[PDB]
Design a protein around this ligand. Structure first.
Ligand SMILES: NC(=O)c1ccc[n+]([C@@H]2O[C@H](COP(=O)([O-])OP(=O)([O-])OC[C@H]3O[C@@H](n4cnc5c(N)[nH+]cnc54)[C@H](O)[C@@H]3O)[C@@H](O)[C@H]2O)c1
Ligand SMILES: NC(=O)c1ccc[n+]([C@@H]2O[C@H](COP(=O)([O-])OP(=O)([O-])OC[C@H]3O[C@@H](n4cnc5c(N)[nH+]cnc54)[C@H](O)[C@@H]3O)[C@@H](O)[C@H]2O)c1
Ligand SMILES: OCc1c(F)c(F)c(F)c(F)c1F
Ligand SMILES: OCc1c(F)c(F)c(F)c(F)c1F
Ligand SMILES: [Zn+2]
Ligand SMILES: [Zn+2]
Ligand SMILES: [Zn+2]
Ligand SMILES: [Zn+2]
Lengths: 374, 374
C-alpha cells in the first residue's frame, strides 16, 4: 500500500528559467484533508508550460509544471467526497470551489481560489507536497502534472468516465476545452458567420473545431508557419493566410477578405500586436474578438479606443469560459459519445522521460500536441 | 413658398478651434433628391459639440456643429418618402440607411454611411448646403443643428409624434438615448446588479436612468465634481464617490465597495485613463465595461490584456447601440407615455442667440443640458 505514506517517484523539475527539465526523484507527501493524490497516466505539452520555461509566465521556481493531464486516484484525504481511489480524473488548473462569487455566477469560471493571478505555487493551504534533494518544490496552478504522482486540492480535480482513454482525454484538461469553449461559449459564434483564428497550434485548432461546430460559414486561419495550414483545413478552416505573404497589414487583408470585417476573431498566440490586429479585423459595429493567448509578463498593449466606441466587443477567457469541475466530466462524456474528435490535435506520443524532446518539438514548430505517457 | 429656394437664416458658425461661435447669416440651399430641409426648433448642447471647439474631436472647419435637436420639416427633395413638410423630426447623427451590412445586422447600429469615423463634413453626396460670407461651410455628422435651417439626408432624419414637445425630445437625439441605451441595450444591465458610472453629465445621468430601469441594486456614481452628486442620486445613484477624496486609486476603492468588482461599469467622460479604470473596476471574471466617452483625437490607451484574459468584457457604442431611425420615434412615443423623464437633464434654457453662454455654462461645470430655442 502507498496510502498515508510519502511516495518517492519520478518528476520533471524546473530548477530555473530557460533550462531543460530535470527528470529525477521527488518525494510526494500524502494528501491532507480535502486533498487528492493522483497517479498520472498522460500529460500534454501546452505552450503555457513552455511560457514558464521562457519567462513569458512568472511563477515561483523551482517548480513541477504541467497542467493538461489525466490520471487515476491513488488516495484521498479526510473529507473528500467527489472522487475515490481508482477513479479516472482530470486535474483542473482553474479550480471550481463552488462557493465564491464567481463560482455562483451563471457565466463566470475564473474561481477566486485560482493560483493564476497572483501565483503562490502551493496547495490551497499555502504549503507544498513536493520535495527534491531535500528542497521544497513549488506547485503549478494547483496541478503539477509533470510527475508520476501529484497532490491536488479537491476543488482542482474532476472525476471522469471510467472507460475514458486517458492518453486522449488529457487534452480536455486544457487545450481542447479552452479552444472549443472560447468559440462556442465565450464568443458564442453564430451560424453562417465569418471567423478569424490567429494561431493554429493545439488551442487554435480547437477554436476552429468550435467555430465549425457552431456552424460558421467561413473560418480564416492565420499563421506565420504555413506548415500548420493543412491540419487547420482538415478541422474546418475554409482558407488559411500567412501575414508574411502580403505587403499590407493582415488586419487590412482580413477586412478585405471578409468584405468589411469578420464576425468573430480569436487571438490564440500570445502577442500584444496580434491581440490588437485580431480586434481590428472584426467588424467595427458588431464584431467580437476573444483573447485566448497568454502575453508576456507585465507588458501593456497600446490601442485606439475608437475601435471599441464604434461597437466592437473585446473579451478574454481562461479555459474556454467553462466552469471546470462541472464541465470536464461532460466534455469527456461528449467525447466518448463521438461529439468531437481529439486525434487531430495529437501529432506525437512520447514516454514521460522524453519531456525535453517534446518541448523541443513544440518550439521547433513541428508538433501540435505531444502527449507524454508515464 | 421657400420650397425650392435658397433660405437666408442665422446659424452658429465655427470658423476656428478654441473660439466662440459666430452667430451670423448663412445661405441654406434647397434639398436635393432624398434630402430634407428642416426648420430647427430646439437643440441641446452636448459635450461632443464642445469637443469640436476644443479639437478633442477633429472634423473639417469651418463648420456648423450641433447634433442633438428637433424641428419641423420645411421641404423635401425629390424621392423622399419617410417625412413630409410640417412633420416633427429629429436629425439622426448616426444614420440608418437600412441597406448596409450593419443596418441589416440585428445588433449593429453604426451604419456605414456615418460621417463619424472619417469625417468629411459634407452631405452624403460629398457637397455642402451651407454658404457663409460666400464661402462653403462644412456640415457636422450630417446634421448641423446649430442653424435656424439645416439640410439632412433622408437616412439621417426620423419622423416623430406630431404632439411631441420639441424642447424636451431633442435630448432623444443624443444624450438621453446614448446613456439609456448604453445601459439597457449595450451593457444589458441585469436586475440586482451593481453598476459604476464614471461621469455624471447629461449622458452619465442617462446611463443611471437606464441602470435603474433595468433593476440594478447599486448604482455608484463617480465624478470629480461633487456638485453633480445630488442630481445623480435623484435619478437613481445609490452612492456617489469623488476620486479626489481617496488616497487609493478609484478602481481599488470601487472594487472594495463592490466586494470584489462591479457587474457593469461605464466610462462617460472621454479620458483614456478613466476608460482603463472603468474596465479594471468591473469584476475580473464576468464584469462588463462600456466606453461611452469620446477620447481625444488619435490617442491610444495603454492596458494590460490580463484584465481581459480573466473574463472581462470591454465594449463601446455610439448612440446607445440604437438603430437610429427605428428607435428614435419609439423613444419619443415612450417619453409621451411617461416611460422615462427628460426634465432631470435640463438645467438651463436659452435662446439660440445665447449659444456661447450655453457653452460657458457647460465648461464651468454648472449645467447638465442647456436647451437652445430658435
Ligand atoms: N486562455 C487559456 O486558458 C489558454 C489555454 C491554453 C493555451 N493558452 C495560450 O494560447 C496560446 C496558444 O497555445 P498553443 O496552441 O498551445 O500554442 P502553439 O502550439 O505554440 O501555437 C501557437 C501558434 O501561433 C503561431 N504564431 C506565432 N507567431 C505568430 C504570428 N505573429 N502570427 C500568426 N501566428 C503566429 C505559431 O506558428 C503557432 O502555430 C499560448 O499563448 C498559450 O499560453 C491559453
Ligand atoms: N458614445 C456616444 O454616442 C456619445 C453620445 C453622447 C456623448 N458622448 C460623449 O460622452 C462624454 C460625456 O458627455 P456629456 O455627459 O455631455 O458631458 P459632460 O456633461 O461634460 O459630463 C462629463 C462629466 O465627467 C466628469 N469628469 C471629468 N473628468 C473626470 C474624472 N477624471 N473623473 C470622474 N469624472 C470626471 C465631469 O465633472 C462631468 O460631470 C463626452 O466625452 C461626450 O463626447 C458620446
Ligand atoms: O494554458 C492554460 C494557462 C493559462 F491560460 C494561463 F493564463 C496561465 F497563466 C497558465 F499558466 C496556463 F497554464
Ligand atoms: O455625442 C455624440 C458623438 C459621438 F459619440 C462621437 F463619437 C462623435 F465623434 C461625435 F461627433 C458625436 F457628436
Ligand atoms: Zn470559486
Ligand atoms: Zn494550457
Ligand atoms: Zn446602413
Ligand atoms: Zn452628443
Amino acid at each position: 500500500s502507498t496510502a498515508g505514506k510519502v511516495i518517492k517517484c519520478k518528476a520533471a523539475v524546473l530548477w530555473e528559467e530557460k533550462k531543460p527539465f530535470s527528470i529525477e526523484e521527488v518525494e510526494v507527501a500524502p494528501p491532507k484533508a480535502h486533498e487528492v493524490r493522483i497517479k498520472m497516466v498522460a500529460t500534454g505539452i501546452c505552450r503555457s508550460d513552455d511560457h514558464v520555461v521562457s519567462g513569458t509566465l512568472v511563477t515561483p521556481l523551482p517548480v513541477i509544471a504541467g497542467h493538461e493531464a489525466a490520471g487515476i486516484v491513488e488516495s484521498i484525504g479526510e473529507g473528500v467526497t467527489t472522487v475515490r481511489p481508482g477513479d479516472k480524473v482530470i486535474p483542473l488548473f482553474t479550480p471550481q470551489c463552488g462557493k465564491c462569487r464567481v463560482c455562483k455566477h451563471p457565466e463566470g469560471n475564473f474561481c477566486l481560489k485560482n493560483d493564476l493571478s497572483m501565483p503562490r505555487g502551493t496547495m490551497q493551504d499555502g504549503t507544498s507536497r513536493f520535495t527534491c534533494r531535500g528542497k521544497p518544490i513549488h506547485h503549478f496552478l494547483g496541478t503539477s502534472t509533470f510527475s508520476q504522482y501529484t497532490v491536488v486540492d479537491e476543488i482542482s480535480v474532476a472525476k471522469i468516465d471510467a472507460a475514458s482513454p486517458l492518453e486522449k482525454v488529457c487534452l480536455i484538461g486544457c487545450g481542447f476545452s479552452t479552444g472549443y469553449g472560447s468559440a462556442v461559449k465565450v464568443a458564442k459564434v453564430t451560424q453562417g458567420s465569418t471567423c478569424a483564428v490567429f494561431g493554429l497550434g493545439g488551442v487554435g485548432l480547437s477554436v476552429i473545431m468550435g467555430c465549425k461546430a457552431a456552424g460558421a460559414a467561413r473560418i480564416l486561419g492565420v499563421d506565420i508557419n504555413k506548415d500548420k495550414f493543412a491540419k487547420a483545413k482538415e478541422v474546418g478552416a475554409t482558407e488559411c493566410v500567412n501575414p508574411q505573404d502580403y505587403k499590407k497589414p493582415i488586419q487590412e487583408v482580413l477586412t478585405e477578405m471578409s468584405n468589411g470585417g469578420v464576425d468573430f476573431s480569436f487571438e490564440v498566440i500570445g502577442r500584444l500586436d496580434t491581440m490588437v490586429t485580431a480586434l481590428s479585423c472584426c467588424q467595427e459595429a458588431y464584431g467580437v474578438s476573444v483573447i485566448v493567448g497568454v502575453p508576456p509578463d507585465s507588458q501593456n498593449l497600446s490601442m485606439n479606443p475608437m475601435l471599441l466606441l464604434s461597437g466592437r466587443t473585446w473579451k478574454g477567457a481562461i479555459f474556454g469560459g467553462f466552469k471546470s469541475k462541472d464541465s470536464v466530466p461532460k466534455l469527456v462524456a461528449d467525447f466518448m459519445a463521438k461529439k468531437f474528435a481529439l486525434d487531430p490535435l495529437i501529432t506525437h506520443v512520447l514516454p514521460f522521460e522524453k519531456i525535453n524532446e517534446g518541448f523541443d518539438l513544440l518550439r521547433s514548430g513541428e508538433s501540435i500536441r505531444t502527449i507524454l505517457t508515464f
